[PDB]
Subunit: 285 residues, 4 copies
């Protein structure tokens, strides 16, 4: 049903700046692999098959991560590091293609999604903002829960997550009547950029996961700095839009402290390094 | 007197592999900046003014990190963010120059040093292996102590650090009559690559920081595929070589666990994030 | 009707070798622009809208040619070279997207076309081999003539061109009953690789222009070095395949002498340099 | 004695613009090889052993051309094509080294030369502007004659070539009492950038080849945005500077017509293609 995802990765990484100066923000190492790997793993494990990277001329190392490397592999063979060569040879499954299109100028998220129009065609599709990592815990990731709701409802999905009341002026916040249960959706009437701590329509923050109809591309061509939130506003005119509330946990890597937070949480969960990483932390005192 | 440092960075690094698949392992993120900035920093706080990168066709991003980035700088100016613009324009003092020579094939450390012959010319010179991060808490860095000693003694210096007895297996070990004290040098007859746990002439491992005379280049054109420890042996037949024993602490950023120890230790002491990071860790166990 | 074209550009350019060593063969300059520009211009002027580059990790400069360049443009503004900035800003029209997918290993033309499966989907599509330039003369290019025949007939088209009898062992040659007129098609039963000068089924050579149905992708997944010619053989089982004979002229840039031949023919036709270029040639004696 | 040559290659070259949009204008194809190989060739046939590239973040392909290409070499071996493999592995003699330093901003020729200060050290040095190709038919190249003269006279050398009287407008022109003969030098008081057609002190244009003493670097730190002709003036107040008048022929590869003249002249005399190319031209008019 939903087989395509747009990962808009053409930013210059002004946030996380020394680190992103000469490599993509997406290629920033989180424990032992680049951040992007975690976002592509999340997509693929919700049944995505076509990864559509909207990219910048400086971001070849992202495309190169999901391609084969002749010199690297023959180095790995010559040293008989055979289990490794097997790991770095199938980062994505056989049936998953990774596709590139260029955002010609940095004119925002709406413009980025519009750049993928030709590749999206008449299909319904997901958007993954890759500066945000989602950790699942439950065995079925939020993106998969949220796609199935989209399939069932044929209503656009905006992933949201409860934040503390006194920190709501940091977020895009959705207008809903009540808040849904975790892993459930409710109809939503709009989103408020950074509402004042007094005056937030809810405590439900936009995380940067979407399932949208193809309609959205003609909407983006007709938006009053082309803004996804008011292409979605325009979709409200003919369509239900629902807010899907995460069951899992987000990490904002675009921001140095939420990066350090992912390294700590993912590191401790590392199926191979977790326990040795725990010991390193305890030794700190 | 010691103004040149050779940083051999041509290695692909199959050791921190997933992370360095598509970026140089020298560009791996350590809190908020690539690992290499900590080594170039080390060299500069010890009086170097010409960083010589002995590099690979896939390492452009290392050179670009020490160059100016036009679209990034302007994006940051016409988004009025000048604290960030400081962080990416003055990585090294205006008088520190970064030059690069290609190591055409991976023929070991000694081939890499010898690739720098046309740039070192008649000058004596430091060698820093950028996979090893050295942290000083003294305010005179181990490389500066080691350069003081070279200038005084005129004796070639090999930086070393005691390892547990059951791991001498893993390192070059210096052939030395007595352990020098932390901060001090003594004469050495040679190094032994991975002596068996039984048979080691010390517990002092070769760490990856050397001070060498220009004349090792001629030696390196004659070794018995070119090994620096052999050129150091040959030098022995004419000149005093000494083992400098470090006072600082090391992190092998080549190993997944030495890299995570660097992220913890360097992070805990970040000026800004230090306290917030410190707090993230407490919020865990 | 036909809106998509696959340009398979992942070769390492073993032919035209010194020139292609460190830049794409596709980026080799023909008068005053890279060869690829001529192939993309030909596609767009036959109504192609989606350029699907099947590419290699070494071929970023091809994608960069059809993208915007921040530093280049601001250099061009600062020098008030305003007519130039306008030329290098719209190399392709507004409605044309350029898309990338990687050929993970160099396993031939059939495998290259198969790499674009996800992007081609259920659409019928053209294949342009970009080492071959076609010059039109007539005002309607052969690719457009050939697409319309495909539309009309719903029979796959293989572009061919009459070559001298005594040079037929240099070409893939089509099996047809008679030869069609220029700008016309006839049913074809197969293609013979480099038949002996005695024993060629015709004098009609495969040029490297195709219009194929989407079917072809499941055929390529089921080919006995995956070979397009025997995916087309397999299509013969359920479909007419026709040979469309050029009205225009080809130049094989993959081969140093056919490169020099394009530079001479395109150079003389240059709407701005043609006549001054003629004079330069006459001066040769 | 003269063993270093500085090749300033950091310029974007908006002059041969379409062609150099996405590749360096130094990597532009001249018959079968990039333009730069003809200049590095010129330097090496005249006794240079350290090519110093003063380069830009977008020019990796220049350095890669003088380095080894692993996937290309092996692809060529396991496709048994060893004449081709010779053409890409021995571009420069084993003892010629290529090093690179970044010109951080485009502040003219004088800024570029001064970027090479840490590499030139105390050595005198040649400067070659790679947009100009010099062809010798004598068997001693103009740069070798000019280096002979420097060594003899100890006088700084500026290579020059007479231009028609109605174009002195377009060039730096040397202030000289009498024209030297082809192959010979005389004393010069200064250069005048684009004197009006009336007011020129000679018809001898500055061509873009200099031999300079180490001490121009100190001068370049003090010029009245840094202009080499000003540093040369300052040098005048202490040392004889001479104008060397060339015997060879020039091609401005920066101009679309000077580049096409290079393709004709160098092609006509290619060992192999020479005769075939010669014939292609006859088959035209």
């Amino acid at each position: 049903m939903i087989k395509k995802a747009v990962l808009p990765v053409a930013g210059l990484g002004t946030r996380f700046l020394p680190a992103s100066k000469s490599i993509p923000k997406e290629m920033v190492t989180v424990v032992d692999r680049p951040a992007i790997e975690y976002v592509v793993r999340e997509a693929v494990e919700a049944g995505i098959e076509q990864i559509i990277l909207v990219t910048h001329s400086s971001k070849a190392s992202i495309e190169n991560y999901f391609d084969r490397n002749f010199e690297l592999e023959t180095t790995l063979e010559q040293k008989k590091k055979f289990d490794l060569l097997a790991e770095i040879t199938q980062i994505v499954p056989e049936h998953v293609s990774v596709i590139s299109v260029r955002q010609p100028q940095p004119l925002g998220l709406g413009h980025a999604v519009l750049c993928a129009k030709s590749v999206v065609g008449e299909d319904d599709f997901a958007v993954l903002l890759p500066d945000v990592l989602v950790k699942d815990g439950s065995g079925q990731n939020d993106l998969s829960r949220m796609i199935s709701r989209y399939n069932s409802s044929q209503a656009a999905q905006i992933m949201v997550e409860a934040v503390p009341d006194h920190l709501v002026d940091q977020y895009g916040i959705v207008d809903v009547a009540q808040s849904p249960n975790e892993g459930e959706s409710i109809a939503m009437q709009g989103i408020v950029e950074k509402p004042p701590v007094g005056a937030a329509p809810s405590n439900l923050s936009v995380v940067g996961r979407y399932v949208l109809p193809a309609k959205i591309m003609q909407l983006l061509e007709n938006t009053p700095e082309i803004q996804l939130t008011d292409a979605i506003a325009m979709l409200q005119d003919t369509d239900t839009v629902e807010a899907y509330r995460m069951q899992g946990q987000t990490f904002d890597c675009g921001s140095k402290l939420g990066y350090l937070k992912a390294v700590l949480h993912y590191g401790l969960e590392h199926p191979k390094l977790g326990m040795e990483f725990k010991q390193l932390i305890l030794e700190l005192k």
